[PDB]
Symmetry: C4
Subunit: 300 residues, 4 copies
């Protein structure tokens, strides 16, 4: 049976975070705009996911103008608002950068690098990989690595597809250059993938679909900032209390086209401020968590 339902069980390791933090926070900014479904991108259909058009369907072989425009908000305006927020609050980001999206807006990528944020690969295209053949999925991976290396000067050491298929994580681990991937939702702590060997260990840093602004546009989620703030506050409070004895981590997922809207950004800043008002909080990039785990908890 190939699934690990057990994990650490009732005995998770103490992460011993920097500063003996009671909680580690990983803010993640997705950058997908310009890489989504679009006939202009070589796709058979328009995009339908994660936009204000909460009931949208993909349209075959045509452009959906409103949908394109909603995505353009993220790359034109939302991204800059959010970069300014993270700079103002002095909180690092891991950016889940879709390589095609990056290619179409190199100046924002440069700004992200300038501000010291990690550029993590979010795949070549922002599409569903469920049914993609292995050779083609591998080709996309290599191309994503190539593009991100050229744009930033350094290869990505993290990987996150999101809409994975049965081969995705295997291919990541086979490529061999990734310190971690985040294509799981299965824990409150990093862990070494069962496929790890002494020679090739691979760290998993689980991500999130719940403390994630994508829920502002899904059939169940949040309709305002107050609700999102309360949700994040609760997660923080529970984990921070656990961290009196057993610290964990919390990921916070963000999208430029979504929380980049001023109506939603207020709650994000309020949460950052709330977190910052507590001592023993570690605000980390995913790569930093990965390098910490290699040092503190090496694979055995």
């Amino acid at each position: 049976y190939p699934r690990d339902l057990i994990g650490y069980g009732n005995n998770p390791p103490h992460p011993h975070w920097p500063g003996d933090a009671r909680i580690a926070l990983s803010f993640v900014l997705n950058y997908e705009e310009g890489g989504e479904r679009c006939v202009l991108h070589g796709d058979k259909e328009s995009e339908a996911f994660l936009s204000e058009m909460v009931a949208a369907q993909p349209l075959q072989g045509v452009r959906h103008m409103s949908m394109e425009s909603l995505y353009e908000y993220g790359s034109r305006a939302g991204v800059w608002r959010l970069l300014k927020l993270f700079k103002r609050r002095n909180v690092p980001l891991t950016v889940f950068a879709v390589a095609m999206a990056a290619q179409r807006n190199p100046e924002v990528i440069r700004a992200m690098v300038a501000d010291g944020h990690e550029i993590c690969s979010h795949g070549y295209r922002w599409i569903d990989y469920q049914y993609m053949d292995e050779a083609q999925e591998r080709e996309h991976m290599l191309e994503a690595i190539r593009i991100l290396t050229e744009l930033t000067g350094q290869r990505p050491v993290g990987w996150y597809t999101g809409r994975t298929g049965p081969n995705t994580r295997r291919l990541v681990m086979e490529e061999g250059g990734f310190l971690y991937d985040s294509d799981t939702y299965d824990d409150d702590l990093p862990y070494w993938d069962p496929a790890s060997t002494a020679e090739k260990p691979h760290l998993v840093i689980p991500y999130t679909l719940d403390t994630n602004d994508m829920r502002f546009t899904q059939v169940q989620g949040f309709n305002n900032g107050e609700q999102f703030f309360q949700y994040l506050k609760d997660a923080f409070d529970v984990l921070y209390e656990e961290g009196a004895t057993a610290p964990k981590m919390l990921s916070i997922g963000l999208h430029c086209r979504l929380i980049g809207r001023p109506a939603r950004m207020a709650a994000l800043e309020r949460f950052i401020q709330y977190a910052q008002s507590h001592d023993k909080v570690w605000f980390a990039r995913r790569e930093d968590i990965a390098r910490h785990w290699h040092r503190e908890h090496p694979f055995q």
Copy 2:
């Protein structure tokens, strides 16, 4: 040859220098669609399904859907007047996104809107989806909307908003040549000149909104109540007003007669207006006034 502008102003948006050196411009928009929606009586092949209390409704083929008609009639009979009274009471101007067929069917409300000084912007001839409409028919609808709105108001509309555009809609608007602006985008916090603009024919885009919009009261996972809507608008205002200490932007607030015209929802709208009015340096504008301002302050070059 990639036709989408993902970059826009980048990290260097212009200072709009709003009237009164406002830190934020607010554009309240009242849609008037009731009487122009899908209905077999309007020549459509199906009943309306969108933007009503029947949040799970589907279009019914070739038949009248009585409850759906009735819900729309609320907007034209009662909701619209409640809202006009509110904006008069608070002394806040509207841009009305007027569907021409809807306007034809209730000329008295159009006259009242004009009397109160609100802009009448074209919201197309029919309140239907134009995604798949042939260019010839879309052009004829445009001309008819212009004709009707001119007759009813005495002046041609200078703005355009379809909503459910097709790949030709914005091109046709710019081709017609008589529109100062259109609002068929959701791509920025400021107006900008469309890439298709020329020295002889500049065309201004004033981005609209699907988020600070009462349509969300009837969409899946939408606002449960007015408090939530008020908080949503307040947050947008607060963030932008703070930005406006150095770099003012604008905010659109989208409204529908059959939706926020209900007393349960109108309370939050009035609360938001009062909240905004309690701040100095807020410019409450019609879209055409924003357009005129942009021509003067930031002419196309």
Copy 3:
């Protein structure tokens, strides 16, 4: 030719001169549908899918859906009694929208409703969609609903509300001739005389609601808790009560036994009633009482 009235009272609604010169009339409506819904046991082709905790439910063809049956049984076994106790405790009259088959299956609750002085209004023979039903069969259902409700209560119903009407429903109600009012519209804040009224046969319309209605607790957009519902009702009340300083209106509040009969939801309802009761000049009315009042104060011309 256009058969819809988009205009209504326009900007000149009549002053209703409510009893006690009330600033607002409140109509609390309790639906009683449980035992009349879709079920193969009831002669239907499929199980029920609407208005239950299973928000994503679809009808199942030709079989029983046990969980769905059970959720409906909660309303007839437990929810209804909780609600009747609440309205007795607060001394607020109801109009009950009673489905005739549901009533047949629980005559004791009907008797209790009559004992407490609530109006029994017809909600049709079956709780099903009438959109596609042939006229003859719809008329048969109507006559049967009248017959059953007359037998159970001792008096024929004088009100009618199907909900899921078809294009013939309201015409048939008016043709029957024994109804003082119907509530199969969502088009106004006041009663009005149907355009089909004559001096000989006036017919009053008392518009109902899909927004201030607990059905929204189980729809894809609505409420997830009582606090939200309370605030929604409070806002509706506040806006209308303020309008009523000069132009009083009415508000309907729709309730279902299986929904707001759950203790988690009933708290908000009681809180709203108390809030309403804390204000002077509030008329808590049965729909029949509103209808009787309109006949006296605003007779058809």
Copy 4:
């Protein structure tokens, strides 16, 4: 007409709860992770129900990796967080344990038994039984009983399928070894099933789909914990007031993968604390409610 629309009518019995409680609370922890739809479990499709992927559909004949991962959260992390909560607050649980899920994580089953929680059968598989053949459903029931007996040392005395078919409850009563089942949503009190006899009475303890964390992932659902807390508080307040003269019960349904997330757990703890701040509250296992009803209100 086979349905009982009438029940107790306006004359429900006084339950005379232990301690003359004004309300009985039944907290129920579902344990389903590892028994859901999965090709690895022999199913034809992947799971789609009750996860953060609030718009998911079953995928035919393939694995849906994100969906598997979200379920693994419940068995790896959420379950332990919740067991710690109930131990900390000293509140007993009835666990609706799916037999296959239990098989795959015997350590958590042992921890549940150690903590004194009831292990109730939640069926052999966590699948829809609407369209299951009668003989096959009977087979599953027998297997669920066998597995649960083996793991805990004692046969389950309670039964809850959830997604029943027209034969499920009949089969439970036919088996004859269940003190109660909870496959109804029809009352605020236990009652004897109409099929009961003097020789074989069968108690029904109605469950809930409203005071249930499944709503955090259903189309209309709670945005956040505060809303769930208020929902539960209102239920408690109304029933506690009724209980001045006519006490009833309230079920609170929980899932490891859902309320086991720290963002949602805060509200649950807040509610337990709120309840505990009132006198005359009986926190009960469903089996305890069943044994009480046999003593206080025997079938006649």
